[PDB]
Write a protein that binds this ligand. Structure first.
Ligand SMILES: Cc1cn([C@H]2C[C@H](O)[C@@H](COP(=O)(O)OP(=O)(O)OP(=O)(O)O)O2)c(=O)[nH]c1=O
Ligand SMILES: [Ca+2]
Ligand SMILES: [Ca+2]
Ligand SMILES: [Ca+2]
Ligand SMILES: [Ca+2]
Ligand SMILES: [Ca+2]
Length: 901
DNA sequence: CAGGTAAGCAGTCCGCG
DNA sequence: GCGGACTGCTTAC
């Protein structure tokens, strides 16, 4: 097999590299890598190296990396550009792996671990590490085993061994329900003292040294805690054994409000799963506890126990250890679903970066562009310092708030990357500028044609047309990967809908799920077999279809995120290729494109409807248009349709056969107007939306920009078994909205869109009457909590104290002088409840850490004093009043003449 | 900690005769 | 009481 790196580090004048050799074995080597950098040279000096602008460069070979670094400094002192990859390990990888890397994940040691630490005096601070580590579960992907290190004797209690047999038993048998599929994979090691546990852990670590190290909060808790605890007991040199090169450093992570410390382990790639999840999942959760996320992702019940965690070990060590093992497994189950590790490996190896650099699109693109340019003996420019400057973004159309019955949407495929490719936007393709007319002049095609030579954006920028820039070239490659994966995602989705239809008529049989590839549209033979299957087999197939869809979604959406990130990287001052002219070329072209095509679509539809000045495009945001199809439906007449699906077909066909060609023609003209390099503005139908045929549903409504809801029947070629609500911006979509309120508002909207005003009124009246019975957590608002200390004036709200911060200050007073009560963590999320006047907490709200029950000390008082009236008014009635006035109906029945009977 | 901008709503403070 | 200036938070794209 071809060799591939595992990790790479620079340590002084050495590159330290762990890799897989040609025989599939893991090796390590120290290389005295001599880097090259570059300086401009005279034209009369023959060379093969040119900067991106075609200027000749001489290559400078240094005796060592420190010499190269010093030269860079002196070049700054002189005032001359020092060209080339200043991050020598990326140059090392580029030299050592000069080919498309083909990696084998089965050879990469992926470690997933979690630690337990009993603490009687509050949260165990990793930088202090003053409490014993009393459990470690460490799963190794190569052995496929969970290694359990269990401390039996501690100053906080001596316990009996954990029993695998009890762990396996059902909760109803007194057991812990550790999943049977992992029972045989547990290797259990009890220890009579902490020193021996830790020494054995380090010996194990030496044998099975993680390449990728993950787990939940490992970078902020487990890793610094283990490191610091070993450091406290044995000294620094022993703690550094966590690094295969015996090198670590404390890294200080700074944000706007403060800073925190992590431990960089040289020769390890830490991918904390919480951070993977936040970057790649495209969720925003009310809580990020593993219990909360596990429940969300896997629908597994919360790990139940009595008393505080600080007493769990001594009260029930059996459960304590089982829960540590289950916690490690949960992360593996989440990754089995979401495939974020797989994604990280793919993207890292593609770019030729340390795997942990996938978190940084700037680093990712710097490396991709460097490798691409190097292939042609081109030399990258030095990074420079830039002041942060604002610049313009997208256009958003102001919609008229209203109900909208029939709606068809269209948007650009991969909008910003397509603009980059079409216009040819790149650092080295800038050809010059032209005199700009007001945007509306280009939108209305009255402005002078910008250029007859170069490819243009309406911000005034011109680009060469003779060759592709490195940015278009490289963005195209990742776009193509994205498209492939989206294909699989959509096929899995469509396949899922076939199974849901079939589930309306399950056969009374004992049979098996079909062995099929869900990434490809079911053949007719598969469809026939499915129509004969039992519910059990069909549900298992649906589960598999949906897992395939999730897998496809991860692959596609994060590749989209990467290419979109290049468009923004051009507008980040730390990017080597930062240029506001290019960042603005993209966004301004986007503004023009949307408003251009809005005009073209209106003109086209006014023409086919025999009207003038009518607005068919009701809304648009960035790269999308929403078209009212009422008149199209009305031209055939609602009476002519057999069922809902009939008019959906008709609109689908109308969009595909009439609208899309018209849209394409309009964009080709725009491309020609801008003299662009390649027509790549492809605006395909997204949604077909309307009420169910013969119902009183309103179909859809807008309240304002970025706030709307649609009853969708077909999304990007997926025809749903059941209509699906596309809701954007409204309170149902906000993590700040109470969970039960999100649910109720969603049901109000469903009724509005599908059934009508009377159905909405029936549900409101019931919700208003019954909501007081809702569990307090389900009706609590949620907010991130920043700057708690800034607004704290002697434990009371300072001036301008935000509402959620006030709640926290209230909480802090109520738990005063408790090491045991859970503290609110600066920067994390809290639940927030309003309090009735005259309450014992002495303020109008209380907040406590999100994802948790409020401490028993105050729980009963909170329940007693909760202000249900304020809560309902603010989270439910106010937003619902917004939805219904926009939609022009009433959530409460108004009086009529009939009442007199 | 980790590409970008546009823009919504909650809440504070305070004016508005 | 609602709006504007402002802070804070959150989402759409
Ligand atoms: C979703 C999203 C969009 N955008 C910008 C860049 C996008 O190209 C543009 C339009 O967004 P989208 O229409 O959401 O995405 P897209 O056009 O890139 O891809 P698709 O083919 O799935 O439609 O808005 C971001 O900058 N960040 C984001 O997270
Ligand atoms: Ca724990
Ligand atoms: Ca799009
Ligand atoms: Ca599309
Ligand atoms: Ca059947
Ligand atoms: Ca869009």
């Amino acid at each position: 097999m071809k060799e591939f790196y595992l990790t790479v580090e620079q340590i002084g004048d050495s590159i330290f590299e762990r890799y897989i050799d040609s025989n599939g074995r893991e090796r390590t080597r120290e290389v005295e890598y001599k880097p090259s950098l570059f300086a401009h040279c005279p034209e009369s000096q023959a060379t093969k190296y040119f900067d991106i602008y075609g200027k000749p460069c001489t290559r400078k070979l240094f005796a060592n990396m420190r010499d190269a670094s010093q030269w860079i400094k002196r070049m700054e002192d002189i005032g001359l550009e020092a060209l080339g990859m200043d991050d020598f390990k990326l140059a090392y990888l580029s030299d050592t792996y000069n080919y498309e890397i083909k990696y084998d994940h089965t050879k990469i040691r992926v470690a997933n671990f979690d630690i337990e630490v009993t603490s009687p005096d509050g949260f165990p601070e990793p930088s202090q590490a003053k409490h014993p580590i009393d459990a470690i579960t460490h799963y190794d992907s190569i052995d496929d085993r969970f290694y359990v290190f269990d401390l039996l004797n501690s100053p906080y209690g001596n316990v009996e061994e954990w029993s695998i047999e009890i762990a396996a038993k059902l909760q109803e048998q007194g057991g812990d329900e550790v999943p049977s599929e992992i029972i045989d994979k547990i290797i259990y090691m009890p220890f009579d003292n902490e020193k021996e546990l830790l020494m054995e852990y380090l010996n194990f670590w030496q044998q099975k040294t993680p390449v990728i190290l993950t787990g939940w909060n490992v970078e902020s808790f487990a890793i610094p805690y283990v490191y610091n605890r070993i450091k406290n007991i044995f000294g620094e040199s022993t703690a550094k054994r966590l690094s295969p090169h015996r090198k670590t450093r404390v890294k200080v992570i700074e944000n706007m409000y403060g800073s925190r410390e992590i431990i960089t382990l040289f020769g390890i790639s830490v991918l904390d799963y919480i951070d993977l999840y936040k970057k790649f999942s495209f969720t925003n959760q009310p809580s990020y506890s593993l219990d909360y996320i596990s429940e969300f992702e896997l629908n597994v019940g919360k790990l139940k126990y009595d008393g505080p965690i600080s007493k769990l070990r001594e009260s029930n060590h059996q459960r304590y250890i089982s829960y540590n093992i289950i916690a490690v497994y949960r992360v593996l189950q989440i990754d089995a679903k979401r495939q974020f590790i797989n994604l990280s490996l793919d993207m890292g190896y593609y770019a030729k970066i340390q795997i942990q650099s996938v978190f940084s699109p700037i680093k990712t693109w710097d490396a991709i562009i460097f490798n691409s340019l190097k292939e042609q003996n081109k030399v990258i420019p030095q990074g420079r310092s830039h002041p942060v400057q604002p610049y313009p973004g997208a256009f958003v159309k102001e919609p008229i708030p209203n109900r909208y019955k029939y709606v068809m949407s269209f948007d650009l495929t991969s909008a910003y990357p397509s603009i980059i490719r079409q216009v040819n936007i790149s650092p080295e393709t800038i050809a010059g500028t032209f005199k700009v007319a007001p945007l509306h002049d280009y939108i209305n095609a009255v402005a002078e044609r910008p250029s007859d030579v170069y490819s243009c954006s309406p911000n005034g920028m011109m680009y060469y047309k003779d060759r592709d820039g490195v940015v278009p070239t490289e963005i195209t490659k990742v776009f193509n990967q994205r498209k492939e994966h989206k294909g699989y995602m959509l096929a899995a989705q469509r396949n899922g809908e076939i199974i849901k239809e079939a589930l309306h008529n399950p056969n009374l049989s004992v049979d098996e799920p079909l062995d099929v590839d869900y990434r490809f549209d079911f053949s007719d033979e598969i469809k026939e077999k499915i129509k004969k299957l039992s519910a059990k087999s069909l549900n298992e197939m649906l589960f598999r279809a949906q897992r395939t869809e999730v897998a496809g979604m991860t692959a596609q959406i994060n590749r989209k995120a990467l290419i979109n990130g290049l468009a923004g990287a051009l507008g980040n001052v730390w990017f080597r290729y930062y240029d506001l002219r290019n960042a603005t070329a993209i966004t301004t072209f986007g503004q023009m494109a949307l408003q251009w095509i809005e005009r073209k679509v209106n003109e086209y539809l006014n023409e086919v409807c025999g009207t003038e000045g009518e607005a068919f495009v009701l809304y648009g945001d960035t790269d999308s248009i929403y078209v009212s199809a009422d008149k199209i439906i009305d031209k055939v007449g609602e009476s002519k349709f057999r069922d809902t699906n009939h008019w959906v077909d008709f609109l689908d066909k109308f969009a595909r056969e009439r609208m899309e060609p018209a849209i394409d023609r309009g964009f080709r003209e725009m491309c020609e107007y801008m003299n662009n390099k390649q027509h790549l503005m492809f605006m395909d139908r997204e949604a077909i939306a309307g009420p169910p045929l013969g119902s009183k549903g309103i179909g859809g409504f807008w309240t304002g920009k970025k706030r709307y809801a649609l009853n969708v029947w077909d999304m990007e070629g997926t025809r749903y078994a059941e209509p699906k609500l596309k809701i954007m911006g409204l309170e149902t979509q906000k993590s700040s909205t109470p969970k039960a309120v999100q649910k109720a508002l969603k049901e109000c909207i469903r009724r509005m869109l599908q059934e009508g005003e009377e159905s909405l009124q029936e549900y409101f009246k019931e919700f208003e009457k019954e909501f007081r019975q809702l569990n307090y957590i389900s009706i609590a608002s949620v907010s991130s909590a920043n700057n708690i200390a800034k607004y704290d004036v002697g434990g009371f709200p300072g001036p301008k104290c935000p509402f959620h911060i006030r709640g926290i200050l209230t909480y802090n007073r109520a738990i005063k002088g408790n090491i045991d009560a859970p503290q609110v963590v600066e920067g994390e999320k809290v639940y927030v409840l309003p309090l009735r006047e005259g309450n014992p907490f002495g303020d109008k709200c209380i907040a406590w850490p999100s994802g948790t029950e409020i401490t028993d000390l105050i729980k009963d008082d909170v329940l007693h004093w909760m202000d249900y009236t304020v809560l309902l008014e603010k989270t439910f009635i106010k937003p619902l009043e917004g939805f219904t006035s926009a939609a022009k109906l009433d959530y409460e029945k108004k009086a009529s003449l009939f009442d007199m009977f």
